[PDB]
Structures are given as C-alpha cells and as structure tokens.
Structure 1
Amino acid sequence: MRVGIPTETKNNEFRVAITPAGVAELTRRGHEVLIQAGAGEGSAITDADFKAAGAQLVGTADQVWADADLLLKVKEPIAAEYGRLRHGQILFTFLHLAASRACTDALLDSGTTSIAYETVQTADGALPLLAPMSEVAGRLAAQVGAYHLMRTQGGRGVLMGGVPGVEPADVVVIGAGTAGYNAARIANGMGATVTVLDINIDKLRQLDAEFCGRIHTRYSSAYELEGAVKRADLVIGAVLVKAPKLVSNSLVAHMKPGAVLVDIAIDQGGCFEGSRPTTYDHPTFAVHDTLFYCVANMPASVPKTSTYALTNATMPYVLELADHGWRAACRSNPALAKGLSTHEGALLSERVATDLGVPFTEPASVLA
C-alpha cells in the first residue's frame, strides 16, 4: 500500500512522522512511501535523505493526503486539513480527541479510520508510543528549568550543581513515572540535590536502587509535598494519570522568590493550580514571586531527538498496518486496537464518547 507523511502544519511543530530508516523498511516490504517536500527539514532530514531511502517526494499536502492509504502524522489534523480527511484512509497520529470536539467531529463526519498514538496500550497498561515523548519531556524539563533558574531569565539565580563549597539547586520532581524519572536523572546529572515524590513505593525503590540513594525519595503526601515544595529552587510537575492539581496557588505563595515551576503535565490540564499552556515565544509567566514554565508540546523543541524517539516506537505498528490493513492489524494486536478512534462515522473510544456526550460504538463490533 501507499504510506503518506505530510509536513506538520501546527505552529512550531517541527517533528515528522517518519525517518529514512522507516522509509527504507516500508520500501523494502514493497510499500510505496509518499512524503511532502520539506516534511523532514525541521528534524534535519532533507528531501534527498528521504528519496535515497526510497520515498516519492510530492509538492503538495493534498497529493499526499489524496494518494495515501495510510496517513502518518505527529499531531492531530487542524482546521486547514479537515477537508483532506477521507473514507478508506487510515490516520495514525496523536489525536487527543477528548480535548477537541472539532477534531473528533471532523474525523467522524469524514468517515475516516483513525487510531491514536497515545491510547495504544500494552496489557501491562504501558503506553509505548507516548513513552518516548514522556522521556524527552522529562529530560527537557531539567534543562529548561536549569536555564530559567538564571536571574537573567527571572529565576532565583541559582546554578543547578553549585560549585565546590556552595549549595546546589534544590530540585523537587512530583511523580516517579517515565517523565518524572527522566527529569530527576538529568537534574541529578547536573549536580542538583533532587528529591522525587510518589505514592508508588515500588517506583521510589527503583530510584533508590538505580542512583544508590543519590536521588532522594519521599512518600508523597500533601504534607510532605508542601514541605518539599517550600524548600525547592526548581519544581517539576510530572504526574501522569485529567491531571490532579497538587500545587495550589496558596502553596506557591510560600515558595522562595524566583523559584521555577516546570509543568510537564500541561498536555492534560497541568498539575499546578496556576498552570496555563504557554508557547515558545512567551514560555513563562509569574505566579506570586515564582516563575511558571508550561509550554505545550515540549518535545517539539528538540525535533531531531523526538522524531527518532517517536518513530522508533511507532515503526512496528506502522509496518503491521501497512502489511495487514487496519482491521487485521488490530485483530492481531489488542494494544494497537486500544488506539482505535473512529471508523466510518463510529466513535470507537468509550472515554471520548462519554466526555463528549456522543454515542459510543464498541470496537469489537467494527472488527467484525
């Protein structure tokens, strides 16, 4: 079949839904790959690189959408693309349908078959396509937080690791899941004193074992959180579940002046009461005497790393969908089936259907 990857069109979205490794593998299996000219430029993949791997490069967005049987993207389609959606095409991308009725309705009205990266889920409950984006966000949180700690950025003016004889930044990571663990490991590699809070004591055991106690772990109670947050130079909100609000504005009021709060959970409401999504040009805002950083889609800022991280994870699903079509691919792999979102006007996600007050169609009935 024909696999199409258009240029991402969201403001500041520089990732692309495939790399040449991926193109080469599809091509080797007798799939034709159609890529819009310039699609990989944000990720430092040239048209030449993609063509060498086997792709046909196409001038236009609508030719890619009109000719592909499988359409790969990174983000959900936006308004300018709604008219490009079609019956008989499989769309595989991050969808976040609960967050957009316009998107969901555009997909339902088009008749298209869509599968969401973020709800693909293995039997142990893990989200293997979301996982690499959580790793990158976690790692970025630490770097971005160190930088905004600079006084020239409105921060308290504290270097992460201090220097001999001088106190390091005190870093608090809320959440020991994927993002959280990654934020802590990098803030620790920068010499900061890192404390991670979680109510999952097994996750705290893993940290304790992996850094041999260097990363502090505390059982997360409201009481312990308040105390840790009042002492912090840097707070990283890394709770994945809507995200609960663990840091009240009352609490922020008692923080050290110039403390930085980095909200990774922003892609689901934020885990700070005061969080509201930001953009790259205006990344941070003040709450009380404190600095909030809440940019949406953090991994888009490092496209060369994120493109590879995302697509290395999606590749085996991409291959199964190309080889076997959506129905058979979903029937063979219940993890892939958990991502099924729409098909010929049916909404196949019970979570989205109940959030939106839309009829739910059971996935099982469409796979027969």
Structure 2
Amino acid sequence: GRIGIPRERLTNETRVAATPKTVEQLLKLGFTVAVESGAGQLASFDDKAFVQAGAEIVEGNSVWQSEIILKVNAPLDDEIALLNPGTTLVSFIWPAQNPELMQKLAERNVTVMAMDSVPRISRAQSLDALSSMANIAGYRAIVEAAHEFGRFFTGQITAAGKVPPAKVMVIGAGVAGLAAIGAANSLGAIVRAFDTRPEVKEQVQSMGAEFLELDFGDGYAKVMSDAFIKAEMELFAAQAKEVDIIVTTALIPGKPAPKLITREMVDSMKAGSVIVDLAAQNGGNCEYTVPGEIFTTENGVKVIGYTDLPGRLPTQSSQLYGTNLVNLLKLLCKEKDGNITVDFDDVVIRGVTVIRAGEITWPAPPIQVS
C-alpha cells in the first residue's frame, strides 16, 4: 500500500497534498509514503521534514509508481500517462466542467476520487476540502485587504487624534464570507454582511457583524425576481459609498460569477478603498476585476482579484487539505492495514468516486436514506 505525493506542477501552485504531520497519520493507517523531492518546498516543508515524519524521498517520476496518488490539482496532460492501471488518484477534478479530463483518466484504468465532489452532509465535514479552502480564502482576503489598505483597520486613540475603525462589507456569508467577517471583526472593523439566505442571520450576528436587510412565490423565485435584484443592487450601491473594504464571495462552480458590484458603484467609493473579489476565478463579482491581478481604478480603488488565495497561505492550506485526504483514507481503510476498500454503500465514498476501475461513476445520485 504505497501512497505517492508528487510535486504540484500546475504553474505557480505552492500547496502539497501532505505535510510531515499528515504523513505520520498516513503511516498509522498502514500505508507507506513516498514524497517527490521538492514537493513541500513552497509550503515550507523541506525533504528532511518529510523523512523525519517517516516518508521516503524519491526523484523524477518514481512517485507515480504507487498504489495511491494524493494531489491538490488534477494531473496535467503529460502526467496522465504516468498513471498505472489500478492506481487510486485523489485530487480536485471538477468532473462537470472537464469531460475531456474525465475521458483521459478513464482510459488509464484507475479509480479517481474528486475532492470537489464530497457530499455536503454533516458526517463529511472533516473531509470537505472545498470548505477547508474557503475558510482559508476568507481569512486571507482580509490579510490581502489589510496589506493594500493605506489606513488602520483598527480604531484607536493616539496622541495625534482618534482614528475610526475601517468599515467592511462582506457579500455572501457562506464559508469564505464568515471567515472574512471573523478576521475583519478580530481587527476591530465595523463589519456588515449581506446574504440572500435569511437563516444565516444569527451566525453573522454572533460574529459581531450587522446583517443587512433589503428595502423591498418561493424563496428561489424571490431572489431571482427583478424587484429583489433591484433592492440588492441599491443596497450595495449605498454601502459602497460608506465602507472602506468590500469582500465578495458569490461563486458557484462552472457558472460565470454574478456582477454585483458595478463600475459605477466602485467609482463612488472613497479613494484607497479595497475590494477583494473571491469570485475572480469565475469572472468576479466586481466589473473592474482583472483575475490574477490587482486593478487600481481611476478614483484610486484597489480591486484585488487573485484566484489563488489558499496558495498564498500555502502551509495552512496544505495542512488542512492534507488532513481532509487523511480523513477520506480513514473511511477507505477501516482496519488500518494499507488496503483501500472503495465501498459504494457509504454515501461519501460514492459521492467522491467519479471514476472506478476505468468506468466513470460520476455523477452520484441524490442522497436518499431510510
């Protein structure tokens, strides 16, 4: 039962699928581990920290000669040839958005587990890589906003005068948004949050933020109605005028991101304001967003549209993601003997297994339990 951890080859990727701490965990599961030399370097894990944990260091493509491969990103074209039949690959895959990739992997006679396809159910939280990464992205967004902001986040009284706190608006109070709210509140900002779902109001309020209400037959139809989208954009246009920081997190995989902050709203903001657009990978929630870059408007607003926020917390992201993969493996390897049993009676194994022994098993059916 050999687990191989390759170096991530997607350009600019700093994360690794295992850390020294998760390797000790994979050994308790009955596996051995080979890590490719240099794989943890950008996440601050050198070869000898892996050796200290109990892994073997290997060079070249020797790492691909293992029963299981743990990666962050999907194998590139030139890495797919290196998968041997009967190998089990665990990575992000995003099957719905990549039929070309799913074809290439199936002709390799491998089993594939997509970390993006973990069922969003309670018992799967400890394996939920999308949530791990979003929590990191939301914290990091505020670090990125503080770095570009030219004023204090924190209110204080100095001998040279009383400094007000920064005002922060967070749009979307899913996982990334809540993490941004938490970080901004920790820095002493006045934080406001909008989310279309009213159920999240007590979460937001407990983390110290104001839940923004709109002016203004089922819920779905209301949030899609012209009236709601008008009230929502007016809310944002008005907040834009008085806040210093906006974090946007409205992202659904595979769909272009809704433009909730227009050129005109950003144009009305105080100079030196910052917008961190966490939907930049799908085009961004802000019309000024240039994915991969910081764009500064003519009125002096910095629109941050980096799409690799977890990769800018690479040590943390590798540790949490790696822990997600460990927790998946605990499920796969119940008796702790280095043997993967891919059991489709377990709903989470079923949800994540998108290829099995050459046969595409994605998509999983709706979960329905007796």
* Residue 251 (structure 1) aligned with residue 265 (structure 2): yes
How far off its partner does 1:82 sit? Answer: 2.8
Where structure 1 has 5 or more consecutive residues not aligned to the other structure, the ranges are: 151-157, 351-361
CA distance in 2, matches of 1:27, 1:340: 23
What TM-score comes out, normalization by structure 2 length? 0.82
Name structure 2 gaps, 5 residues minimum.
215-231
In the TM superposition, what whole-angstrom CA distance separates every residue of 1:172-205 from its partner, at most 9, and x where no partner exists?
A: 1101111101111111211222111112222121
Contact 1:198–1:219, Cα closer than 8 Å, also in 2: no
The match for 2:227 is none
Aligned pairs (5 A) from 1:150-169:
150=150, 158-164=151-157, 165-169=162-166
> Does 2:142 match 1:142?
yes
The residue correspondences of 1:120-135 to structure 2 (distance < 5 A) are 120-124=118-122, 128-135=128-135
The partner residue of 1:299 within 307, 310, 321 is 310
Equivalent position SS for 2:194: strand
Structure 2 residue identity aligned to 1:236: V
Structure 1 pair 230–86 and aligned structure 2 pair: CA distance change class (3 A): farther
> In 2, Cα distance between the equivalents of 1:138 and 1:275?
17
Equivalent residues of 2:7, 2:38 under 8 A apart? yes
Shift in CA distance, 112/270, structure 1 to aligned 2, threshold 3 Å: farther
**What is the one-letter code of the residue matched to 1:200?**
R
Which amino acid is 1:113 matched to? T
**Counterpart selection for 2:350 from 337, 357, 360:** 337
Q: 1:218 aligns with which of 192, 195, 212?
A: 212
Contact (CA 8 Å) 2:95, 2:362: kept in 1 or not? no
Are the counterparts in 2 of residues 73 and 93 from structure 1 also a CA contact under 8 Å?
yes
Aligned pairs, number: 335
The 1:72/1:363 distance shift into structure 2, 3 A limit, reads farther
The match for 2:186 is: 189
The higher-RCO structure (CA 8 Å, 6+ apart) is 2
Decide whether the 8 Å contact of 2:181 with 2:207 is kept in 1.
no
In structure 2, what residue type is equivalent to 1:327?
Answer: V
Match of 1:349, SS state, is coil
In structure 2, the residue matched to 1:277 is 291
Structure 1 length-normalised TM = 0.82
The share of aligned pairs that are identical, in percent, is: 28
Question: Residues 141 and 287 (structure 1 numbering): CA distance in 2 closer, same or farther, change over 3 Å?
Answer: same
Kindly indicate whether residue 296 of structure 2 is the aligned counterpart of residue 286 of structure 1.
yes
Q: Which residue of 2 aligns with 1:355?
A: none
The 8 Å contact of residues 121 and 336 in structure 1, kept in 2 or not, is answered as no
* Equivalent pair of 1:7/1:39 in contact (CA under 8 Å): yes
CA distance in 1, matches of 2:41, 2:84: 27
- Pick aligned residue for 2:277 from 263, 277, 281: 263
RMSD between superposed Cα atoms in Å: 2.5
Map Cα deviations across residues 262-309 of structure 1 (whole Å, 9 max, x no partner): 01123434222333420xxxx301345332111112111122111112
Among 103, 107, 110, the residue aligned to 2:108: 110
Provide the residue aligned with 1:87 in structure 2.
85
Letter in 2 for 1:272: C
Offset at 1:207? 2.1
The answer to whether the Cα contact below 8 Å between 2:289 and 2:295 also exists between their aligned partners in 1 is no
Partner Cα distance (1:173, 1:268) in 2:
18
